[PDB]
RNA sequence: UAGCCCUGAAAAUGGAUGGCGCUGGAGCGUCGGGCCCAUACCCGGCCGUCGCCGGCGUCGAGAGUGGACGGGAGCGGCGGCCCGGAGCCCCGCGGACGCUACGCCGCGACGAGUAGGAGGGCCGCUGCGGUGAGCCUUGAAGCCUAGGGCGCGGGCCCGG
RNA sequence: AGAACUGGCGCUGCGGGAUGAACCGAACGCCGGGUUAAGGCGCCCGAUGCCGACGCUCAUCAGACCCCAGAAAAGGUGUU
């Protein structure tokens, strides 16, 4: 999985072919993050084959729909669980962010594990993304944003170069 | 090979229903444009006649 | 069996008259069935932590 | 200029630069006539970028414009009075050259006959007094 | 340009005859008009016998011709062979068949006419039958040559039957070892 | 599948191809299809004498799908005008070489 | 525990992310929208090769995806005071081009190549049998030329 | 140095890897327009002169893109 662009939260359910030995297989369910619906129905059969004796030529899915959030404008504290490979071993990890939807957090996890632990987006396994409320957050970087009557200025503001007079007679001021 | 779908009467040389497929659907997207100016004005000049 | 066996069916539809397709095909792509979730809901799983 | 043939097309010739031989510039024991390079090392046969081009059949000019003179005719060299009269049914398409071995006395009648037959001679003003 | 297999794109068969025969060309120019204009296949067989080679136009002897026309159903058809007719002295009685061929030999075209036949050429065949209607085309034995009996597997392999080249057939010439069991081996 | 790229085409991307880039083999050559006459003389022995009767048999996989698809010359499409994505790895891996499962309709428009 | 960074980290001409340089990146990781260009691909031109062909119907009179007919019987529509019948034109005597059939035209697909194998040469040099009622002291051969051209090329023609 | 399966150089140019037999693209008639491939887009050098996104990183030996061109154990209250 490339995790190209913004991600997207898919739900996939799925079962295996009706056998003479057993009718009605239980039709399991996951929650896949993928940049479109094809990668969702290709990582679904990655996480299933690690957990059951189901492989994609011996089972079919019945539903792959985008499941999306119930409050896209309500700011939430997300706390997720990883299973990424490192070079030396692989590691269990808790992690928190702060965005407006779960697909805005798991996108921000792949951009974070890419930054800090050099894990590419293929070696990483989400266990479960759920929000927690405030004042149960362990991460102190997120925790300082949990204070009403918050104020901070914008120091040293710079952007939009070559936009004006690539050659000017007016010294920029940081402000 | 003059291009079909880009000039007319070459589609029609190869598909005669494709013309009456066309002027059956320009009618339902010109009459549906009138249905979205009249109904639009009947809710843009509606509350503009309230206050 | 499939050549001799048909012979009981090439001169069976001879007197009855179909287009019986005794020629065989490969496996067709699967037909659109209508799956069922009676009562319960699909069981949610998710991958497990790394412990040696 | 006055003799004015039939249709003259757009004469495009694909290349106007006259293929020369590899190592033409560097000696005079190698004249500019084309001979294709059949070495093992050399890079004109192996045909790298930015080197001496070599002829192949894609430079062949147009079948309706091959052998056309830029005046609009196709040349046909003659020697005397009688075989200028073989060209009387092509006075709008083919033109007559006069060979160098013709003298200046017999180049005087076959330039005056070529006006009574209205045939373009390329050199009407050649080896005159 | 996908297919490295380009080595077969040029079909190999003849388009013209390689000869300079100004009478054979007027028989191709007759029949290559009749090949593409008549809706038949006889005119596209006798056309393609027009080119090719003198190896592939074998001499049809006269007694195969009167053997392959005594059969049922060949009562009144013309014999057609692109190729020459020699006679046999082997056969005595000659029926009065109608033939048509390039180049019948002189001792054959008088043993044909005295029986009451008639030799034709391929100009008075086109004015006879353009379609080839009601004729029999025949062929000589093209693999009867002394060349085609040197040809096989190899003359020293198992079985072989190939007649190896010798300059003088006799004793002490290719009969010493390999050709019998008492010396060397039996091939 | 490291060399190809495929999905499930919809109706107008089975319609775009036959009209704009269809070409029929008559005996062995590819000629512009252009007139209903050039299908009916070749393949009315199976029952699809016009242009849009070919496109039934090729969109719904029909009884004469072999004789319709082997009639068409392969689609000599163009290079896409949006670029591609890495061309070698699978489309699941962020590339575009493999099964893409009806996303092919986004690609066929750029190829033509 | 693991990412970046540093210690660990020594070789001889002056030196190598290619150089210049780069630190709110012109460095590293995960990515987005653009953008630039191969002889690749698409469209079109042109040439060649290969394949399948087309015209001796030059027949303005040839029309053929059925024709003469013909006696035995009625359909309509043409020459009415209900009977219904050849025009071999001629007011025009008129009608382009073409097929070296070893030629001309059509459509389609392909085009790299040392060794090596075949085809074409109206490429070229020397000599003979033909043949141009060929060429010339009113200047042939030969050589030269910042002269005019043709052929993709071998080479060639003409001017001075 | 020697073998097995496939491909390539040998016979082969062209765009790329600064240059390069074999590497990644792609295999060649002569060209006009269009689009891409591997690649790249501060200046040499066609193209980021986008008001690019989120981080990591101070090196008195920075780092910088397959094969490919100089490195390990062990260690750091550097720092995440
Ligand atoms: Mg070499
Ligand atoms: Mg060398
Ligand atoms: Mg050679």
Interior/surface letters F73-107, b for 16+ CB within 10 angstroms, e for the rest: eeeeeeeeeeeeeeeeebbbbbbbbbbbbebbbeb
Closest CA relative to residue E126, chosen from E21, E31, E36: E31
Beta-carbon contacts of B4 under 8 Å, excluding residues fewer than 6 positions away, are B10, B11, B14, F19, F20
CB F17 within 8 A of CB F75: yes
- Name the residue among D83, D120, D78, D117 with its Cα closest to residue D100: D78
Q: Which two tokens stand for residue E122?
A: 């391929």
DSSP string across A78-95: EEEEE--B-SS-B--EEE
Q: How far apart (Å, rounded) are the C-alpha atoms in residues E10 and E24? A: 26
Distance CA A105, CA A78 (A): 7
Distance, CA of A95 to CA of A87 (rounded, Å):
20
User: Encoding tokens for residue E119?
Assistant: 């030799």
Residues contacting F90, CB < 8 A, separation 6+: F1, F97, F98
Subunit contact F36:B1, Cβ cutoff 8 A: no
- H/E/C letters for each residue in F30-79? EEECCCCHHHHHHHCCCCCCCHHHHHHHHHCCCCCHHHHHCCECCCCCCC
| Nearest protein residue by Cα to C1' of nucleotide H55 | A115
Phi, psi values for residue A59, rounded to 5° = -165, 150
Cβ of A38 and F93 within 8 Å?
no
* β-bridge pairing A126-132 and D94-98: unpaired
CA of residue A86 relative to chain centroid, distance: 18
Looking across all nucleic acid strands, the nucleotide with the smallest C1' to CA distance from residue D40 is G114
Tell me which chain F residue has its CA closest to the CA of residue A42. Answer: F92
Angle among Cα D96, D99, D101 to the nearest 5 degrees reads 155
Q: Are F112 and F17 in contact (CB under 8 A)?
A: yes
Closest-CA residue to A15 (of A65, A62, A53, A67): A62
Residue numbers 70-129 of A with CB closer than 7 A to any atom of strand G: 86-89, 91, 110-112, 114-118, 120-121
Residue A43 gets which letter from DSSP? H
Which of C40, C45, C51, C52 to substitute to test the interface with A, most A CBs within 10 Å? C45
Check residue B43 and report its DSSP letter. Answer: H
Q: Rounded distance, CA A66 to CA F42, Å?
A: 48
Output Rg (C-alpha) for chain E, integer angstroms: 23
Give the DSSP per-residue string, D46-82.
TT-SSS-----GGG---TTTTT--TTS-EEEEE-SSG
Residues whose CB is less than 8 angstroms from the CB of residue A104 and which lie 6 or more positions away in sequence, other chains included: A6
Contact criterion met (CB below 8 Å) for D32 and D24: yes
DSSP secondary structure code for residue D71 in this structure: T
Ramachandran angles phi, psi of E128, nearest 5° = -80, -65
Name every residue whose Cβ is closer than 8 Å to that of residue B19 and which is 6 or more positions away in sequence: B8, B11, B12
Closest CA-bearing residue to C1' of G43: F78
What is the radius of gyration, based on Cα positions, of chain F?
16
Measured in angstroms, how far is the CA atom of residue D33 from the centroid of ligand 2?
22
A-chain residues near C30 (CB < 8 A): 60
**Do residues E136 and E69 touch, judged by C-beta distance below 8 A?**
yes
Stretch (H or E) spanning D115: helix D106-116
> C9: which residues sit within 8 A by CB, 6+ positions away?
C20, C22
Ligand 3: distance of its center to the CA of E9 in Å?
21
In whole angstroms, give the CA distance from residue A3 to residue A39: 9
Shortest CA distance to A80 belongs to which of A145, A131, A139, A140?
A131
Angstrom CA distances, F46 to D9, D71, F67, stand at: 49, 59, 8
Helix (H) or strand (E) holding F17: helix F12-21
Asked if C touches A (at least 3 Cβ pairs < 8 angstroms), the answer reads yes
Torsion of CA E74, E77, E79, E81, to 10 degrees: -100
Query: B14-48 as b/e, with b when 16 or more CB fall inside 10 Å?
Result: bbeebeeeeeeeeeeeeeeeeeeeeeeeeeeeeee
Q: Which two tokens stand for residue E142?
A: 């093209």
Nucleotide nearest to D39 (CA to C1'): G114
Provide the strand spans (E) within chain D.
Answer: 74-78, 94-98
Tell me which nucleotides of strand G come within 7 A of a protein CB.
1-4, 24, 28-36, 39-44, 46-56, 101-102, 107-115, 132-141, 149-155, 157-160
Q: Which residues pair with E118 in a beta bridge?
A: E98
Q: Measuring CA to CA, which residue among D77, D67, D75 is closest to residue D110? A: D77
Token pair, residue D129, equals: 């007094």
Best B2, B4, B5, B18 residue to mutate vs chain F (most F CBs within 10 Å): B4
For residue A158, give the nearest of A134, A174, A141, A136 by alpha carbon: A174
- Across the interface, of A27, A28, A90, the residue whose CB is closest to C50 is A90
| Residue with tokens 């012979």, as numbered in its chain | C7
For chain A, give the number of residues: 175
Provide CB contacts within 8 A for F25, sequence distance 6+: F71, F72, F73
Say if CB F30 and CB B14 are below 8 A apart. no
Longest dimension (CA), chain E: 68
Q: What is the spatial distance, in angstroms and rounded to an integer, between the CA atom of D123 and the C1' atom of G159?
A: 8
Beta bridge partners of A96: A79
- With a CB cutoff of 8 Å and minimum separation 6, the contacts of D60 are D14, D66
Distance (Å, rounded) from C-alpha E161 to C-alpha E174?
Answer: 14
- The whole-angstrom separation of Cα A35 and Cα A32 is 10
Q: How much is the CA Rg of chain B, to the nearest whole Å?
A: 19
How is residue D27 written in tokens?
């000696």
Strands A9-16 and A28-33: antiparallel
Q: To one decimal place, what's the resolution in Å?
A: 3.7
Name the method of structure determination: cryo-EM
Q: Using DSSP, state whether A63 is helix, strand or coil.
A: strand
Contact by Cβ (8 Å): E91, E64? no
Neighbouring residues of A139: CB distance < 8 A, sequence distance ≥ 6: A95, A96
Question: 3-state SS of chain D: helix, strand, coil percent to 5?
Answer: 20, 10, 75
* Closest alpha carbon to F66 in F88, F49, F43: F43
Question: What are the φ and ψ backbone dihedral angles of D110, each rounded to 5 degrees?
Answer: -90, 5
- CB neighbourhood size of F42 (10 A): 18
For the CA of D40, the nearest ligand: 1
Gyration radius (Cα) of chain C, Å: 24
Residue F93 near chain A (CB below 8 Å): yes
Tokens of C27: 């496996």
Is D95 near strand G, with its CB below 7 A from some atom of it? no
**Ligand 1 geometric centre to CA of D41 (Å):** 6
The distance of Cα E85 from the centroid of its chain, to the nearest Å, equals 10
Structural tokens at position F83: 């670029």
- Closest listed residue to residue E67, CA positions, set E119, E141, E145: E141
**β-strand partners of A28:** A14
Nearest of E125, E140, E146 to residue E63 by alpha carbon:
E140
Ligand 3 centroid to Cα of residue D25, in Å, is 27
| CB-neighbour burial class of residue F20 (10 A; exposed 0-12, middle 13-18, buried 19+) | middle
Question: In angstroms, what is the span from residue D38 Cα to ligand 3's centroid?
Answer: 8
In this structure, the protein residues whose CB atom falls closer than 7 angstroms to any atom of nucleic acid strand H are: A 108, 111-112, 114-116, 159-163, 166; D 14-15, 40, 45-49, 56-60; E 1, 4; F 78-84, 86-88
Q: Provide, in whole angstroms, the distance separating residue D30's CA from nucleotide G160's C1'.
A: 27
The number of residues in chain D equals: 129
Query: Would you give the DSSP letter of residue C44?
Result: B
Closest residue, CA to C1' of G49: E10
Please state, as a whole number, how many other Cβ atoms lie within 10 Å of the Cβ of residue D123. Answer: 13
Please answer whether residues A111 and A171 qualify as being in contact, where contact means their C-beta atoms are separated by less than 8 angstroms: no
Which chains does D contact via 3+ CB–CB distances below 8 A?
none
**F19: contact with B, CB 8 A cutoff:** yes
CA E152 to the chain's CA centroid: 21
Contacts of B5 (CB under 8 A, 6+ apart): B11, F16, F19, F20
DSSP 3-state of A61: strand
Query: What are the Cα distances from residue C3, in Å, to C7, C8, C15, C23?
Result: 7, 9, 19, 10
The three-point CA angle D29-D34-D37 to 5° equals: 85
Distance CA D72, CA D13 (A): 14
Q: How buried is residue E77: exposed, middle or buried, by Cβ count under 10 Å (0-12/13-18/19+)?
A: middle
Nucleotides of H under 7 A from a protein CB: 11-15, 24-31, 34-39, 49-56, 80
Check: CB of residue A151 under 8 Å from CB of residue A163: no
Instruction: Report helix, strand or coil for D122.
Output: coil
Signed CA dihedral, D81, D85, D86, D90: sign only: positive
Q: How far, in Å, CA of D77 to CA of A146, rounded?
A: 103
Q: What is the DSSP string of A113-145?
A: HHHHS---TTS--EEEEEEE-TT----HHHHTT
Q: Give the C-alpha separation, E11 to D14, whole Å.
A: 33
Q: Would you call A91 an interface residue with chain C, using a CB distance cutoff of 8 Å? A: yes
Alpha helices, H only, chain E: 25-35, 62-65
C-alpha F72/C-alpha F21 separation (Å) is 10
The reply to whether residue B10 touches residue F33, judged by beta carbons under 8 angstroms, is: no
DSSP secondary structure string, E120-157? E-TTTTTTT-SS-TTEEE----TT-SSSTTS-SS-TTS
The dihedral through the CA atoms of A22, A26, A30, A34 has a sign that is positive
> Considering all CA atoms of chain F, what is the largest pairwise distance in Å, rounded to the nearest integer?
47
Element (H, E) at D107: helix D106-116
């Amino acid at each position: 999985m490339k995790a190209s662009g913004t991600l997207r939260e898919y739900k996939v359910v799925g079962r295996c072919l009706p056998t003479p030995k057993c009718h009605t297989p239980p039709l399991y369910r996951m929650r896949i993050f993928a940049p479109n619906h094809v990668v969702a129905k290709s990582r679904f059969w990655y996480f299933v084959s690690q957990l059951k004796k189901m492989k994609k030529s011996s089972g079919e899915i019945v539903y792959c729909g985008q499941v999306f959030e119930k409050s896209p404008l309500r700011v939430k504290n997300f706390g997720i669980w990883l299973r990424y490979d490192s070079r030396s071993g692989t590691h269990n990890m808790y992690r928190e962010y702060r965005d407006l939807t779960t697909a805005g957090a798991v996108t921000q996890c792949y951009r974070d594990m890419g930054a800090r632990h050099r894990a590419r987006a293929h070696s990483i396994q989400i266990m479960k993304v759920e929000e927690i409320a405030a004042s149960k957050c362990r991460r102190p970087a997120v925790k300082q944003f949990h204070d009403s009557k918050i104020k901070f200025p914008l120091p040293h503001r710079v952007l939009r170069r070559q936009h004006k007079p690539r050659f000017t007679t007016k010294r920029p001021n940081t402000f | 090979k003059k291009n079909p779908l880009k000039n007319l009467r070459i589609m029609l040389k190869l598909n005669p229903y494709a013309k009456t497929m066309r002027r059956n659907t320009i009618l339902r997207q010109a009459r549906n444009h009138k249905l979205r100016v009249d109904k639009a004005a009947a809710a843009a000049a509606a509350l503009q006649a309230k206050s | 069996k499939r050549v001799k066996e048909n012979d009981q069916k090439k001169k069976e539809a001879k007197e009855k008259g179909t287009w019986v397709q005794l020629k065989r095909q490969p496996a067709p792509p699967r037909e659109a069935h209508f799956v069922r979730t009676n009562g319960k809901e699909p069981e949610l799983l998710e991958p497990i932590p790394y412990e040696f | 200029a006055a003799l004015r043939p039939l249709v003259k097309p757009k004469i495009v010739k694909k290349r106007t630069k006259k293929f020369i031989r590899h190592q033409s510039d560097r000696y005079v024991k190698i004249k500019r006539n084309w001979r294709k390079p059949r070495g093992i090392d050399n890079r004109v046969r192996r045909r790298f970028k930015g080197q001496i081009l070599m002829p192949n059949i894609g430079y062949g000019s147009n079948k309706k414009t091959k052998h056309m003179l830029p005046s609009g005719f196709r040349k046909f060299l003659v020697h005397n009075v009688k075989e200028l009269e073989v060209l009387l049914m092509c006075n709008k398409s083919y033109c007559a050259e006069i060979a160098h071995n013709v003298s200046s006395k017999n180049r005087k009648a076959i330039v005056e006959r070529a006006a009574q037959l209205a045939i373009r001679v390329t050199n009407p003003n050649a080896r005159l007094r | 340009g996908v297919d490295i297999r380009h080595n077969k794109d040029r079909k190999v068969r003849r388009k013209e005859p390689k000869s300079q025969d100004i009478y054979l060309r007027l028989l191709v120019k007759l029949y290559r008009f009749l090949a593409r204009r008549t809706n038949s296949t006889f005119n596209q067989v006798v056309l393609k016998r027009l080119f090719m080679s003198r190896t592939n136009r074998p001499p049809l002897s006269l007694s195969r011709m009167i053997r392959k026309m005594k059969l049922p159903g060949r009562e009144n058809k013309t014999a057609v062979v692109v190729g020459t007719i020699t006679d046999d002295v082997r056969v005595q009685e000659v029926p009065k068949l109608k033939v048509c061929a390039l180049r019948v030999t002189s001792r054959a075209r008088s043993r044909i006419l005295r029986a009451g036949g008639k030799i034709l050429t391929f100009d008075q065949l086109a004015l006879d039958s353009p379609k080839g209607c009601g004729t029999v085309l025949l062929s000589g034995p093209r693999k009867g040559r002394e060349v085609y009996r040197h040809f096989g597997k190899a003359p020293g392999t198992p079985h072989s039957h190939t007649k190896p080249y010798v300059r003088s057939k006799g004793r002490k010439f290719e009969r010493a070892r390999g050709r019998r069991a008492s010396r060397g081996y039996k091939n | 599948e490291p060399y190809i790229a495929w999905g499930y085409p919809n109706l107008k991307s089975v319609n775009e191809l036959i009209y704009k880039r269809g070409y029929g083999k008559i005996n062995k050559k590819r000629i512009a299809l252009t007139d209903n006459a050039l299908i009916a003389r070749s393949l009315g022995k199976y029952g699809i004498i016009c242009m849009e009767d070919l496109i039934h048999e090729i969109y719904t996989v029909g009884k004469r799908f072999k004789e319709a698809n082997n009639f068409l010359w392969p689609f000599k499409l163009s290079s896409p005008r949006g670029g591609m994505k890495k061309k070698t790895t699978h489309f699941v891996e962020g590339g575009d070489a493999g099964n893409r499962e009806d996303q092919i309709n986004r690609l066929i428009r750029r190829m033509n």
